Amino acid sequence: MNIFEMLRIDEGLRLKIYKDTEGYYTIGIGHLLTKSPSLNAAKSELDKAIGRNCNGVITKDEAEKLFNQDVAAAVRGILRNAKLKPVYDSLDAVRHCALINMVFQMGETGVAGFTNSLRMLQQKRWDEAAVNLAKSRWYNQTPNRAKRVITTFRTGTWDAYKNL
């Protein structure tokens, strides 16, 4: 397991524009196109991202390209964020992936507001952090995914993803 395999499980792969769990137009492996309710606006964003008129469809290779860019942006984003970088650098490589996963899903500003959970993670209070992480809109709206990410933080193993 690695971050790409983890997020591929959590995000799926769809080659046509679809709406994500929040109702926002998306494509590929969780590539958010826009929060606009306009499909035409989403199609424009897609064409800009791919560099050709796609008319709402992409290839697997194009999906994977966007995915590589998006994962790298999540990581580099964490490193550029004064709240997230010290927590990230305090973690082991499996728990790194759990934090990247959260940022991929909800953005850096959103995860940097999990201030008390982040403190518990930095303190390596894993069971406490797990409890705290679950007291969130995140957990309530996407419980199965959040449970997997939280188990990853709790245990520092891939147990929640191995078998999937």
PDB file of C-alpha atoms in Angstrom:
ATOM      1  CA  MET A   1       0.000   0.000   0.000  1.00  0.00           C
ATOM      2  CA  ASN A   2       1.001   3.650  -0.669  1.00  0.00           C
ATOM      3  CA  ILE A   3      -0.841   6.946  -0.946  1.00  0.00           C
ATOM      4  CA  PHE A   4      -1.833   6.361  -4.575  1.00  0.00           C
ATOM      5  CA  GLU A   5      -3.359   2.962  -3.877  1.00  0.00           C
ATOM      6  CA  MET A   6      -5.072   4.325  -0.739  1.00  0.00           C
ATOM      7  CA  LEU A   7      -6.701   7.262  -2.517  1.00  0.00           C
ATOM      8  CA  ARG A   8      -7.606   5.111  -5.517  1.00  0.00           C
ATOM      9  CA  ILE A   9      -9.631   2.939  -3.138  1.00  0.00           C
ATOM     10  CA  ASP A  10     -11.255   5.916  -1.393  1.00  0.00           C
ATOM     11  CA  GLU A  11     -11.968   7.974  -4.554  1.00  0.00           C
ATOM     12  CA  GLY A  12     -12.652   5.435  -7.250  1.00  0.00           C
ATOM     13  CA  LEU A  13     -12.050   5.956 -10.961  1.00  0.00           C
ATOM     14  CA  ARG A  14     -14.668   7.413 -13.306  1.00  0.00           C
ATOM     15  CA  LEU A  15     -13.846   8.693 -16.784  1.00  0.00           C
ATOM     16  CA  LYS A  16     -16.926  10.867 -17.274  1.00  0.00           C
ATOM     17  CA  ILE A  17     -17.832  13.971 -15.246  1.00  0.00           C
ATOM     18  CA  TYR A  18     -19.801  12.916 -12.152  1.00  0.00           C
ATOM     19  CA  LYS A  19     -20.917  14.582  -8.911  1.00  0.00           C
ATOM     20  CA  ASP A  20     -18.909  13.856  -5.774  1.00  0.00           C
ATOM     21  CA  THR A  21     -20.388  13.130  -2.337  1.00  0.00           C
ATOM     22  CA  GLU A  22     -20.965  16.919  -1.802  1.00  0.00           C
ATOM     23  CA  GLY A  23     -22.695  17.294  -5.169  1.00  0.00           C
ATOM     24  CA  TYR A  24     -19.722  18.918  -6.946  1.00  0.00           C
ATOM     25  CA  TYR A  25     -18.578  18.108 -10.462  1.00  0.00           C
ATOM     26  CA  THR A  26     -15.577  15.804 -10.462  1.00  0.00           C
ATOM     27  CA  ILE A  27     -13.757  13.430 -12.771  1.00  0.00           C
ATOM     28  CA  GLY A  28     -11.080  10.795 -12.678  1.00  0.00           C
ATOM     29  CA  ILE A  29      -9.741   9.765  -9.259  1.00  0.00           C
ATOM     30  CA  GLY A  30     -11.473  12.432  -7.223  1.00  0.00           C
ATOM     31  CA  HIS A  31     -10.380  15.409  -9.303  1.00  0.00           C
ATOM     32  CA  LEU A  32     -12.722  18.211  -8.227  1.00  0.00           C
ATOM     33  CA  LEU A  33     -13.481  20.377 -11.222  1.00  0.00           C
ATOM     34  CA  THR A  34     -15.484  23.219  -9.680  1.00  0.00           C
ATOM     35  CA  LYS A  35     -18.004  23.925  -6.942  1.00  0.00           C
ATOM     36  CA  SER A  36     -20.167  25.724  -9.582  1.00  0.00           C
ATOM     37  CA  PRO A  37     -23.590  24.135 -10.216  1.00  0.00           C
ATOM     38  CA  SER A  38     -22.944  24.749 -13.923  1.00  0.00           C
ATOM     39  CA  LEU A  39     -22.017  21.684 -15.949  1.00  0.00           C
ATOM     40  CA  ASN A  40     -20.730  23.954 -18.733  1.00  0.00           C
ATOM     41  CA  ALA A  41     -18.393  25.588 -16.216  1.00  0.00           C
ATOM     42  CA  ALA A  42     -17.201  22.133 -15.111  1.00  0.00           C
ATOM     43  CA  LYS A  43     -16.560  21.148 -18.749  1.00  0.00           C
ATOM     44  CA  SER A  44     -14.500  24.257 -19.251  1.00  0.00           C
ATOM     45  CA  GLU A  45     -12.439  23.493 -16.160  1.00  0.00           C
ATOM     46  CA  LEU A  46     -11.888  19.970 -17.463  1.00  0.00           C
ATOM     47  CA  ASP A  47     -10.693  21.172 -20.860  1.00  0.00           C
ATOM     48  CA  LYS A  48      -8.301  23.656 -19.169  1.00  0.00           C
ATOM     49  CA  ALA A  49      -6.930  20.882 -16.925  1.00  0.00           C
ATOM     50  CA  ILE A  50      -6.348  18.409 -19.765  1.00  0.00           C
ATOM     51  CA  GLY A  51      -5.379  20.849 -22.497  1.00  0.00           C
ATOM     52  CA  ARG A  52      -7.947  19.752 -25.113  1.00  0.00           C
ATOM     53  CA  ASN A  53     -11.753  19.871 -25.592  1.00  0.00           C
ATOM     54  CA  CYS A  54     -12.775  16.691 -23.779  1.00  0.00           C
ATOM     55  CA  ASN A  55     -16.506  17.232 -23.846  1.00  0.00           C
ATOM     56  CA  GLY A  56     -16.736  15.711 -20.392  1.00  0.00           C
ATOM     57  CA  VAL A  57     -14.712  12.560 -20.988  1.00  0.00           C
ATOM     58  CA  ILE A  58     -11.131  11.565 -20.331  1.00  0.00           C
ATOM     59  CA  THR A  59      -8.874   8.548 -20.699  1.00  0.00           C
ATOM     60  CA  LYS A  60      -7.416   6.474 -17.817  1.00  0.00           C
ATOM     61  CA  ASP A  61      -3.960   7.884 -18.526  1.00  0.00           C
ATOM     62  CA  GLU A  62      -5.339  11.425 -18.296  1.00  0.00           C
ATOM     63  CA  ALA A  63      -7.100  10.563 -15.045  1.00  0.00           C
ATOM     64  CA  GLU A  64      -3.870   9.196 -13.623  1.00  0.00           C
ATOM     65  CA  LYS A  65      -1.990  12.313 -14.699  1.00  0.00           C
ATOM     66  CA  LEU A  66      -4.409  14.560 -12.857  1.00  0.00           C
ATOM     67  CA  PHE A  67      -4.217  12.244  -9.860  1.00  0.00           C
ATOM     68  CA  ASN A  68      -0.425  12.457  -9.711  1.00  0.00           C
ATOM     69  CA  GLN A  69      -0.638  16.237  -9.865  1.00  0.00           C
ATOM     70  CA  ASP A  70      -3.338  16.344  -7.166  1.00  0.00           C
ATOM     71  CA  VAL A  71      -1.464  14.082  -4.739  1.00  0.00           C
ATOM     72  CA  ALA A  72       1.720  16.106  -5.171  1.00  0.00           C
ATOM     73  CA  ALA A  73      -0.198  19.324  -4.630  1.00  0.00           C
ATOM     74  CA  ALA A  74      -1.744  17.937  -1.408  1.00  0.00           C
ATOM     75  CA  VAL A  75       1.698  17.007  -0.061  1.00  0.00           C
ATOM     76  CA  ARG A  76       3.467  20.160  -1.072  1.00  0.00           C
ATOM     77  CA  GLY A  77       0.500  22.098   0.315  1.00  0.00           C
ATOM     78  CA  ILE A  78       0.939  20.440   3.713  1.00  0.00           C
ATOM     79  CA  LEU A  79       4.614  21.341   3.690  1.00  0.00           C
ATOM     80  CA  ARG A  80       3.748  24.979   2.923  1.00  0.00           C
ATOM     81  CA  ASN A  81       1.148  25.212   5.689  1.00  0.00           C
ATOM     82  CA  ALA A  82       2.479  26.367   9.097  1.00  0.00           C
ATOM     83  CA  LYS A  83      -0.182  24.363  10.999  1.00  0.00           C
ATOM     84  CA  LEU A  84       0.172  21.134   9.054  1.00  0.00           C
ATOM     85  CA  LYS A  85       3.918  20.876   8.348  1.00  0.00           C
ATOM     86  CA  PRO A  86       5.031  20.224  11.980  1.00  0.00           C
ATOM     87  CA  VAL A  87       2.368  17.576  12.450  1.00  0.00           C
ATOM     88  CA  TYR A  88       3.251  15.944   9.136  1.00  0.00           C
ATOM     89  CA  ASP A  89       6.963  15.903   9.875  1.00  0.00           C
ATOM     90  CA  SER A  90       6.295  14.345  13.299  1.00  0.00           C
ATOM     91  CA  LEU A  91       4.534  11.322  11.769  1.00  0.00           C
ATOM     92  CA  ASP A  92       5.651   7.986  10.374  1.00  0.00           C
ATOM     93  CA  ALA A  93       5.161   7.174   6.681  1.00  0.00           C
ATOM     94  CA  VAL A  94       1.853   5.296   7.084  1.00  0.00           C
ATOM     95  CA  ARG A  95       0.281   8.067   9.135  1.00  0.00           C
ATOM     96  CA  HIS A  96       1.621  10.601   6.596  1.00  0.00           C
ATOM     97  CA  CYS A  97      -0.730   8.987   4.132  1.00  0.00           C
ATOM     98  CA  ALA A  98      -3.746   9.413   6.408  1.00  0.00           C
ATOM     99  CA  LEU A  99      -3.034  13.152   6.649  1.00  0.00           C
ATOM    100  CA  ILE A 100      -2.531  13.462   2.880  1.00  0.00           C
ATOM    101  CA  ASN A 101      -5.820  11.618   2.393  1.00  0.00           C
ATOM    102  CA  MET A 102      -7.689  14.154   4.549  1.00  0.00           C
ATOM    103  CA  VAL A 103      -6.141  17.095   2.720  1.00  0.00           C
ATOM    104  CA  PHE A 104      -6.962  15.531  -0.651  1.00  0.00           C
ATOM    105  CA  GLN A 105     -10.598  15.209   0.422  1.00  0.00           C
ATOM    106  CA  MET A 106     -11.221  18.481   2.252  1.00  0.00           C
ATOM    107  CA  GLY A 107      -8.372  20.839   1.433  1.00  0.00           C
ATOM    108  CA  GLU A 108      -5.531  22.220   3.499  1.00  0.00           C
ATOM    109  CA  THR A 109      -7.427  25.003   5.230  1.00  0.00           C
ATOM    110  CA  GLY A 110     -10.083  22.505   6.290  1.00  0.00           C
ATOM    111  CA  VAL A 111      -7.662  20.009   7.789  1.00  0.00           C
ATOM    112  CA  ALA A 112      -5.592  22.786   9.466  1.00  0.00           C
ATOM    113  CA  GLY A 113      -8.795  23.705  11.407  1.00  0.00           C
ATOM    114  CA  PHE A 114      -8.719  20.146  13.116  1.00  0.00           C
ATOM    115  CA  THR A 115      -6.521  21.890  15.644  1.00  0.00           C
ATOM    116  CA  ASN A 116      -7.169  19.642  18.659  1.00  0.00           C
ATOM    117  CA  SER A 117      -6.883  16.419  16.642  1.00  0.00           C
ATOM    118  CA  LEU A 118      -3.631  17.625  15.084  1.00  0.00           C
ATOM    119  CA  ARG A 119      -2.217  18.328  18.541  1.00  0.00           C
ATOM    120  CA  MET A 120      -3.093  14.826  19.699  1.00  0.00           C
ATOM    121  CA  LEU A 121      -1.448  13.352  16.597  1.00  0.00           C
ATOM    122  CA  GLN A 122       1.713  15.397  17.226  1.00  0.00           C
ATOM    123  CA  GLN A 123       1.646  14.101  20.820  1.00  0.00           C
ATOM    124  CA  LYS A 124       1.255  10.518  19.500  1.00  0.00           C
ATOM    125  CA  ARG A 125      -1.901  10.063  21.604  1.00  0.00           C
ATOM    126  CA  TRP A 126      -3.351   7.802  18.964  1.00  0.00           C
ATOM    127  CA  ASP A 127      -6.522   6.516  20.593  1.00  0.00           C
ATOM    128  CA  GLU A 128      -7.404  10.020  21.842  1.00  0.00           C
ATOM    129  CA  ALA A 129      -6.742  11.488  18.415  1.00  0.00           C
ATOM    130  CA  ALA A 130      -9.000   8.822  16.853  1.00  0.00           C
ATOM    131  CA  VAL A 131     -11.839   9.731  19.197  1.00  0.00           C
ATOM    132  CA  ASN A 132     -11.409  13.402  18.515  1.00  0.00           C
ATOM    133  CA  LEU A 133     -11.226  13.003  14.733  1.00  0.00           C
ATOM    134  CA  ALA A 134     -14.628  11.311  14.753  1.00  0.00           C
ATOM    135  CA  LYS A 135     -16.296  14.381  16.343  1.00  0.00           C
ATOM    136  CA  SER A 136     -16.565  16.015  12.958  1.00  0.00           C
ATOM    137  CA  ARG A 137     -18.795  16.744  10.018  1.00  0.00           C
ATOM    138  CA  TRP A 138     -16.245  14.759   8.063  1.00  0.00           C
ATOM    139  CA  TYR A 139     -16.908  11.574   9.959  1.00  0.00           C
ATOM    140  CA  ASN A 140     -20.658  12.023   9.873  1.00  0.00           C
ATOM    141  CA  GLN A 141     -20.828  12.687   6.138  1.00  0.00           C
ATOM    142  CA  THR A 142     -18.346  10.053   4.950  1.00  0.00           C
ATOM    143  CA  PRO A 143     -18.190   7.583   7.840  1.00  0.00           C
ATOM    144  CA  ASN A 144     -16.768   4.541   6.070  1.00  0.00           C
ATOM    145  CA  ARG A 145     -13.876   6.489   4.530  1.00  0.00           C
ATOM    146  CA  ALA A 146     -13.283   8.449   7.715  1.00  0.00           C
ATOM    147  CA  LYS A 147     -13.200   5.219   9.725  1.00  0.00           C
ATOM    148  CA  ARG A 148     -10.504   3.854   7.409  1.00  0.00           C
ATOM    149  CA  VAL A 149      -8.412   7.021   7.687  1.00  0.00           C
ATOM    150  CA  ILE A 150      -8.898   7.145  11.458  1.00  0.00           C
ATOM    151  CA  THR A 151      -7.868   3.477  11.824  1.00  0.00           C
ATOM    152  CA  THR A 152      -4.738   4.320   9.854  1.00  0.00           C
ATOM    153  CA  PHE A 153      -3.940   7.138  12.304  1.00  0.00           C
ATOM    154  CA  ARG A 154      -4.797   4.977  15.293  1.00  0.00           C
ATOM    155  CA  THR A 155      -2.679   2.000  14.316  1.00  0.00           C
ATOM    156  CA  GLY A 156      -0.020   3.191  11.871  1.00  0.00           C
ATOM    157  CA  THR A 157      -0.794   0.130   9.764  1.00  0.00           C
ATOM    158  CA  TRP A 158      -2.627  -0.478   6.495  1.00  0.00           C
ATOM    159  CA  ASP A 159      -5.126  -2.822   8.075  1.00  0.00           C
ATOM    160  CA  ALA A 160      -8.157  -0.760   6.998  1.00  0.00           C
ATOM    161  CA  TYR A 161      -7.082  -0.949   3.307  1.00  0.00           C
ATOM    162  CA  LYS A 162      -5.449  -4.375   3.119  1.00  0.00           C
ATOM    163  CA  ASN A 163      -8.147  -6.660   1.853  1.00  0.00           C
ATOM    164  CA  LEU A 164      -9.607  -3.841  -0.268  1.00  0.00           C
TER     165      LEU A 164
END
